[PDB]
Amino acid sequence: HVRSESSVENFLSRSACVYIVEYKTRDDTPDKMYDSWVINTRQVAQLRRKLEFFTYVRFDVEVTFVITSVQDDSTRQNTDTPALTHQIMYVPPGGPIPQAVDDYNWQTSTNPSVFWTEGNAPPRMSIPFMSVGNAYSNFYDGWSHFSQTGVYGFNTLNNMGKLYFRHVNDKTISPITSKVRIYFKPKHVKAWVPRPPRLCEYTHKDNVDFEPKGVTTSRTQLTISNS
Amino acid sequence: HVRSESSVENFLSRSACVYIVEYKTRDDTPDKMYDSWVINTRQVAQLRRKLEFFTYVRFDVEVTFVITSVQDDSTRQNTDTPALTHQIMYVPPGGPIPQAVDDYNWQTSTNPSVFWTEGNAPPRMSIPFMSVGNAYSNFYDGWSHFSQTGVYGFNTLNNMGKLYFRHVNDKTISPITSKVRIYFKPKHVKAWVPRPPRLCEYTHKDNVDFEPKGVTTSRTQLTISNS
Amino acid sequence: GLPVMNTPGSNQFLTSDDYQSPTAMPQFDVTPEMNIPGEVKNLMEIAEVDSVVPVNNVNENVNSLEAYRIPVHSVTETGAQVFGFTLQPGADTVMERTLLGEILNYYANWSGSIKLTFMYCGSAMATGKFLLAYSPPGAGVPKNRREAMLGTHIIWDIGLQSSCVLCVPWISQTHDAGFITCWYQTSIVVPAEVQNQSVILCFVSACNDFSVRLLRDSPFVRQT
Amino acid sequence: GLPVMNTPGSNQFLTSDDYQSPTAMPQFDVTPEMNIPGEVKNLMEIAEVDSVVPVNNVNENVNSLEAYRIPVHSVTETGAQVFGFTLQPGADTVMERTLLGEILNYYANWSGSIKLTFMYCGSAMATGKFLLAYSPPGAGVPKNRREAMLGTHIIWDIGLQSSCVLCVPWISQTHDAGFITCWYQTSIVVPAEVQNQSVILCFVSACNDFSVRLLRDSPFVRQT
């Protein structure tokens, strides 16, 4: 008789790896030296269901990045590379977008960045509630702009931003790939108008579409008997 | 209805990479073992425009140096080099200037330095308002000394200093190049006599000169119609 | 400066941190909270809602709406059994995908009470009696109307009460849990020009004394 | 000494730090602040300044001073249209490079009001009437003087008011936003020995209820 762990915040405010970001430090294809992530809550199926218990949600965000590096094999594993610096730039809704590792949009002012050297504690940056409306929508029964044009159930209004990742240093002499892991912990959660859990599996991350599943697991009889 | 992010300090007091400084630890050309930077606010075009919203500015300075090292390839990547120490010496307006890595001006007293060993948190040193006059000038309509001699629009008075970089250790046995990144965050900003933004692009970092651009993007008509 | 000693546990990312953090976006104006109706501050508000139970989950009836309808009609015997299911909210396949079973699959420990509700959806002219027996845990399933009668039972008259509510006492999975059987007592007496076949539907929700102790992952979401 | 445990997030350079820092130059005398006139403590003082709008940005007129002059003269019809532009301060190419558009391109969210001002720069002998219609967002552009008349309009008489001010209500891009059209009502009546061709110029500034929420990089500076 406690009911302190059935709270909304003791149910949703837990960290979870949501995406893995792979990028290198020396290539020839000029887009494998960086990677990005458009921030949403629809990639981990667990957290997607736990947020689809409710229609409107409203939370802060605390992201912790776990950054690890492993060198690719070559002729020249015998090297002395100094410690690597990574950049994690945040693009708010309405910000410019880089198109290479040497693009000017890595240098712009109103895109907050974090510079981390190898060996330290993992980085961390908080992201506030940055919607125009009062709460995010998990569900949206309508069109975004000019109905019967545009995708059904979009809700332009609830975008949170996106991240970009590159190695700050120059091109090294051996290829070293770095994979980061993103721990997305929502904070100060308030939820409204609850709704039943999903029964069917998921098919895409941008719509509610499904194949019809059953209702439960079927029995053999209707009346029970002894062992 | 907040207007707390249209403040001058919430618009200008943000960190930005302004310059990359490359230097080695073993060469034959005796000037590629160090590098410098004359401190101004006219290299990032974003920050140059955001400070050319105003004519006079007055700020403290907080510089954070992100230092990374990568070894150059050779026959001898198999080595055990101990951890490197870097020197970041600051020359105030009116100070001596080194001319090599072994020059005496790395050892002088009234040039404050910072010694950083590989692996730690990045260094940081604050730089106060060090002009003779009351505020820096982004714009200066005149000559510095003895008009029609000397460059138009110079303003000798607003120099802030310069930095110098070298590896404190002796010459190693394998070449190791180190690139530092300079995060220039102005503090306690006060601005006066505002002025319109720049329309044209920049051509040099020492004058206001330009090519005449348009005024806006041209339309096809003058009266609007329906879709 | 001040002398400071680093204790062990430094420079690690424990996943259940509670420390402060710097903000990526200071000098930002968060839009204020508007009064939206229907605020949830506790998940055990959600499980206090009655919901239909698929008791008739005999095979090939699950993929339909017949999975909820419990058939009852006129019987030439009198001590037969209408329905029955094991009383395990979350382990049993009957109230597995029920909303209460869905709140209770996110926890390894749970305890409390449980309400059942039985509604008769026949005509207004029919009448009859049922025997809703409750076999406590440890006790077996009765095979007779008479063996179920000497236990804990309730006689529910159709002709004067269209819904009987049966608040089952203490049930737990880590604080065989019981059975709920339904026996005929009399046949369903019907006048002329009134159809014989009829339907019972179930409902279930928790009481206000329901607790849970340890969160986990749900056994129903499978990763692609 | 004192027992101290290192939390995660140590030894990193988060770019939006707020910590203290040691000074490179202590024992230094900073020259004191002098009273310089024209101090800015808020960027939304700057955008409360009226500025000329290049409404006549028909092609090849942009590279001149004709880009601001809106031509108006004597018309043999009476329900024609003088000018018109979409009401989007920052997205539209009309008030794109306007000072208010320049303060508003440094932010991803902005909301508030907007003032328009229309000044007639003809002779002191001319007279006439215009119809400054405001199509609200969602509503289309009218094609008639009469369709614009049943909407929200204002009749602005030249001969007794050389400047009309039109404070447009609530406009936002994340708190089709509207249209401002100008229709002839009467022709411009002119005496002898007074020239027929004349000019209107626009002005725009915000009101005191204007907010912004999230800073970004401007889309107009491109790196060399």
CSV table of N, CA and C in Angstrom, one decimal, chain A residues 129-202:
chain,number,residue,atom,x,y,z
A,129,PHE,N,11.4,22.2,-22.7
A,129,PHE,CA,10.2,22.0,-23.5
A,129,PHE,C,10.2,23.1,-24.6
A,130,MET,N,10.5,22.6,-25.8
A,130,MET,CA,10.6,23.6,-26.9
A,130,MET,C,9.6,23.5,-28.0
A,131,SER,N,8.3,23.4,-27.6
A,131,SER,CA,7.2,23.4,-28.6
A,131,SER,C,6.5,24.7,-28.5
A,132,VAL,N,5.8,25.1,-29.6
A,132,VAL,CA,5.0,26.3,-29.6
A,132,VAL,C,3.7,26.1,-28.8
A,133,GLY,N,3.1,25.0,-29.0
A,133,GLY,CA,1.9,24.6,-28.2
A,133,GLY,C,2.2,24.2,-26.8
A,134,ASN,N,1.2,23.8,-26.1
A,134,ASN,CA,1.3,23.6,-24.7
A,134,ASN,C,1.8,22.2,-24.3
A,135,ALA,N,1.7,21.2,-25.2
A,135,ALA,CA,2.1,19.8,-25.0
A,135,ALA,C,2.3,19.2,-26.3
A,136,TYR,N,3.2,18.2,-26.2
A,136,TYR,CA,3.4,17.3,-27.4
A,136,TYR,C,2.2,16.4,-27.6
A,137,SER,N,2.0,16.0,-28.8
A,137,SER,CA,0.9,15.0,-29.1
A,137,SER,C,1.5,13.7,-29.6
A,138,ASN,N,1.2,12.6,-28.9
A,138,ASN,CA,1.5,11.3,-29.4
A,138,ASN,C,0.6,11.0,-30.6
A,139,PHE,N,-0.6,11.4,-30.6
A,139,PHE,CA,-1.6,11.2,-31.6
A,139,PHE,C,-2.2,12.5,-32.1
A,140,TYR,N,-2.5,12.5,-33.4
A,140,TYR,CA,-3.0,13.7,-34.1
A,140,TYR,C,-3.9,13.3,-35.2
A,141,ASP,N,-5.2,13.5,-35.0
A,141,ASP,CA,-6.2,13.1,-36.0
A,141,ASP,C,-6.5,14.2,-36.9
A,142,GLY,N,-5.6,14.4,-37.9
A,142,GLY,CA,-5.8,15.4,-38.9
A,142,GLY,C,-4.5,15.6,-39.8
A,143,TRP,N,-4.6,16.6,-40.6
A,143,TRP,CA,-3.5,17.0,-41.5
A,143,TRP,C,-2.8,18.2,-41.0
A,144,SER,N,-1.5,18.3,-41.4
A,144,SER,CA,-0.7,19.4,-41.0
A,144,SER,C,-1.1,20.7,-41.6
A,145,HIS,N,-0.9,20.8,-43.0
A,145,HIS,CA,-1.2,21.9,-43.8
A,145,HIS,C,-2.1,21.5,-44.9
A,146,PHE,N,-3.2,22.2,-45.1
A,146,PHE,CA,-4.0,22.2,-46.3
A,146,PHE,C,-4.5,20.8,-46.6
A,147,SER,N,-5.4,20.3,-45.8
A,147,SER,CA,-6.0,18.9,-45.7
A,147,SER,C,-6.3,18.4,-47.1
A,148,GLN,N,-6.0,17.1,-47.2
A,148,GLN,CA,-5.9,16.3,-48.5
A,148,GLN,C,-4.7,16.6,-49.3
A,149,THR,N,-3.8,17.5,-48.8
A,149,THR,CA,-2.4,17.6,-49.2
A,149,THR,C,-1.6,17.5,-47.9
A,150,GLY,N,-0.5,16.9,-48.0
A,150,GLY,CA,0.3,16.6,-46.8
A,150,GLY,C,-0.1,15.3,-46.1
A,151,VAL,N,0.8,14.8,-45.3
A,151,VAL,CA,0.6,13.5,-44.7
A,151,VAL,C,-0.4,13.5,-43.6
A,152,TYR,N,-1.2,12.5,-43.5
A,152,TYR,CA,-2.2,12.4,-42.4
A,152,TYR,C,-1.5,12.1,-41.1
A,153,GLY,N,-1.9,12.9,-40.1
A,153,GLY,CA,-1.3,12.7,-38.8
A,153,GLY,C,0.1,13.0,-38.7
A,154,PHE,N,0.5,14.3,-38.9
A,154,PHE,CA,1.9,14.7,-38.9
A,154,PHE,C,2.2,15.6,-37.6
A,155,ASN,N,1.4,16.6,-37.4
A,155,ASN,CA,1.6,17.6,-36.3
A,155,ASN,C,3.1,18.2,-36.4
A,156,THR,N,3.3,19.1,-37.4
A,156,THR,CA,4.4,19.9,-37.5
A,156,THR,C,4.9,20.5,-36.2
A,157,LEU,N,4.0,20.9,-35.3
A,157,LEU,CA,4.2,21.7,-34.1
A,157,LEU,C,5.0,21.0,-33.1
A,158,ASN,N,5.2,19.6,-33.1
A,158,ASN,CA,5.8,19.0,-32.0
A,158,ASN,C,7.3,18.6,-32.3
A,159,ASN,N,7.9,19.2,-33.2
A,159,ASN,CA,9.3,18.9,-33.4
A,159,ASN,C,10.2,19.4,-32.3
A,160,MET,N,11.2,18.6,-31.9
A,160,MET,CA,12.1,19.0,-30.8
A,160,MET,C,13.5,19.4,-31.2
A,161,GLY,N,14.0,19.0,-32.4
A,161,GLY,CA,15.3,19.4,-32.9
A,161,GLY,C,16.0,18.3,-33.5
A,162,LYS,N,17.3,18.4,-33.7
A,162,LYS,CA,18.1,17.4,-34.2
A,162,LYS,C,19.5,17.6,-33.8
A,163,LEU,N,20.3,16.6,-33.8
A,163,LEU,CA,21.7,16.6,-33.4
A,163,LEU,C,22.6,16.3,-34.6
A,164,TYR,N,23.9,16.7,-34.5
A,164,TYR,CA,24.9,16.4,-35.5
A,164,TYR,C,26.2,16.1,-34.7
A,165,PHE,N,27.0,15.2,-35.4
A,165,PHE,CA,28.2,14.6,-34.7
A,165,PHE,C,29.3,14.7,-35.7
A,166,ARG,N,30.5,15.2,-35.3
A,166,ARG,CA,31.7,15.1,-36.1
A,166,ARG,C,32.9,15.1,-35.2
A,167,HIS,N,34.0,14.6,-35.7
A,167,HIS,CA,35.3,14.8,-35.0
A,167,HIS,C,35.9,16.1,-35.3
A,168,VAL,N,36.2,16.9,-34.2
A,168,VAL,CA,36.7,18.2,-34.3
A,168,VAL,C,38.1,18.3,-35.0
A,169,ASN,N,38.9,17.2,-34.8
A,169,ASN,CA,40.3,17.3,-35.3
A,169,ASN,C,40.3,17.1,-36.8
A,170,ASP,N,41.5,17.3,-37.3
A,170,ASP,CA,41.8,17.1,-38.7
A,170,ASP,C,41.7,15.6,-39.1
A,171,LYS,N,41.8,15.3,-40.4
A,171,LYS,CA,41.9,14.0,-40.8
A,171,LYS,C,43.2,13.3,-40.4
A,172,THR,N,43.0,12.2,-39.7
A,172,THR,CA,44.2,11.5,-39.1
A,172,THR,C,44.9,10.7,-40.2
A,173,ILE,N,45.8,9.8,-39.9
A,173,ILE,CA,46.5,8.9,-40.8
A,173,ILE,C,46.0,7.5,-40.8
A,174,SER,N,45.3,7.1,-39.8
A,174,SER,CA,44.7,5.8,-39.7
A,174,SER,C,43.2,6.0,-39.5
A,175,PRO,N,42.3,5.1,-40.1
A,175,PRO,CA,40.9,5.3,-40.0
A,175,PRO,C,40.4,4.8,-38.6
A,176,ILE,N,39.7,5.7,-37.9
A,176,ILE,CA,39.2,5.4,-36.6
A,176,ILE,C,37.7,5.8,-36.6
A,177,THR,N,36.9,4.8,-36.4
A,177,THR,CA,35.4,5.0,-36.3
A,177,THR,C,35.0,5.2,-34.9
A,178,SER,N,34.0,6.0,-34.7
A,178,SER,CA,33.5,6.3,-33.4
A,178,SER,C,32.0,6.1,-33.4
A,179,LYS,N,31.5,5.4,-32.4
A,179,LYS,CA,30.1,5.1,-32.3
A,179,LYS,C,29.6,5.7,-31.0
A,180,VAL,N,28.5,6.5,-31.0
A,180,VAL,CA,28.0,7.1,-29.8
A,180,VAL,C,26.6,6.5,-29.5
A,181,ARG,N,26.3,6.5,-28.3
A,181,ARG,CA,25.0,6.0,-27.8
A,181,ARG,C,24.3,7.1,-27.0
A,182,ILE,N,23.0,7.2,-27.2
A,182,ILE,CA,22.3,8.3,-26.8
A,182,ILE,C,21.3,7.9,-25.7
A,183,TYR,N,21.4,8.4,-24.5
A,183,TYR,CA,20.6,8.1,-23.4
A,183,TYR,C,19.6,9.3,-23.1
A,184,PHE,N,18.4,9.0,-23.4
A,184,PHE,CA,17.3,10.0,-23.5
A,184,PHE,C,16.4,9.9,-22.3
A,185,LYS,N,16.6,10.8,-21.3
A,185,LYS,CA,15.8,10.7,-20.1
A,185,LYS,C,14.9,11.8,-19.9
A,186,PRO,N,13.6,11.6,-20.1
A,186,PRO,CA,12.6,12.7,-20.0
A,186,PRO,C,12.4,13.1,-18.5
A,187,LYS,N,12.2,14.4,-18.3
A,187,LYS,CA,12.1,14.9,-16.9
A,187,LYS,C,10.8,15.8,-16.8
A,188,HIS,N,10.3,15.8,-15.5
A,188,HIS,CA,9.2,16.6,-15.1
A,188,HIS,C,7.9,16.3,-15.9
A,189,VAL,N,7.5,15.1,-15.9
A,189,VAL,CA,6.5,14.6,-16.9
A,189,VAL,C,5.1,14.9,-16.4
A,190,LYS,N,4.3,15.5,-17.3
A,190,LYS,CA,2.9,15.7,-17.0
A,190,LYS,C,2.1,15.1,-18.2
A,191,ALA,N,1.1,14.3,-18.0
A,191,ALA,CA,0.4,13.6,-19.0
A,191,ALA,C,-1.1,13.8,-18.8
A,192,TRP,N,-1.8,13.8,-19.9
A,192,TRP,CA,-3.3,14.0,-19.9
A,192,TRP,C,-4.0,13.0,-20.8
A,193,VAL,N,-5.3,12.9,-20.6
A,193,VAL,CA,-6.3,12.1,-21.3
A,193,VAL,C,-5.8,10.7,-21.7
A,194,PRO,N,-5.7,9.8,-20.7
A,194,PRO,CA,-5.2,8.4,-21.0
A,194,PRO,C,-6.0,7.6,-21.9
A,195,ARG,N,-5.5,6.5,-22.4
A,195,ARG,CA,-6.0,5.7,-23.5
A,195,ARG,C,-5.4,4.3,-23.4
A,196,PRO,N,-6.1,3.3,-24.1
A,196,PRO,CA,-5.6,1.9,-23.9
A,196,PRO,C,-4.3,1.7,-24.6
A,197,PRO,N,-3.6,0.6,-24.1
A,197,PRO,CA,-2.3,0.3,-24.8
A,197,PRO,C,-2.5,-0.3,-26.2
A,198,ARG,N,-1.5,-0.4,-26.9
A,198,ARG,CA,-1.6,-0.9,-28.3
A,198,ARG,C,-1.5,-2.4,-28.2
A,199,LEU,N,-2.4,-3.1,-29.0
A,199,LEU,CA,-2.4,-4.5,-29.1
A,199,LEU,C,-1.6,-5.0,-30.2
A,200,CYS,N,-1.6,-4.4,-31.4
A,200,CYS,CA,-0.9,-4.8,-32.6
A,200,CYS,C,0.5,-4.4,-32.5
A,201,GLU,N,1.3,-5.0,-33.4
A,201,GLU,CA,2.7,-4.6,-33.5
A,201,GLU,C,2.8,-3.3,-34.3
A,202,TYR,N,4.0,-2.8,-34.4
A,202,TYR,CA,4.3,-1.6,-35.2
A,202,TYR,C,4.8,-2.0,-36.5
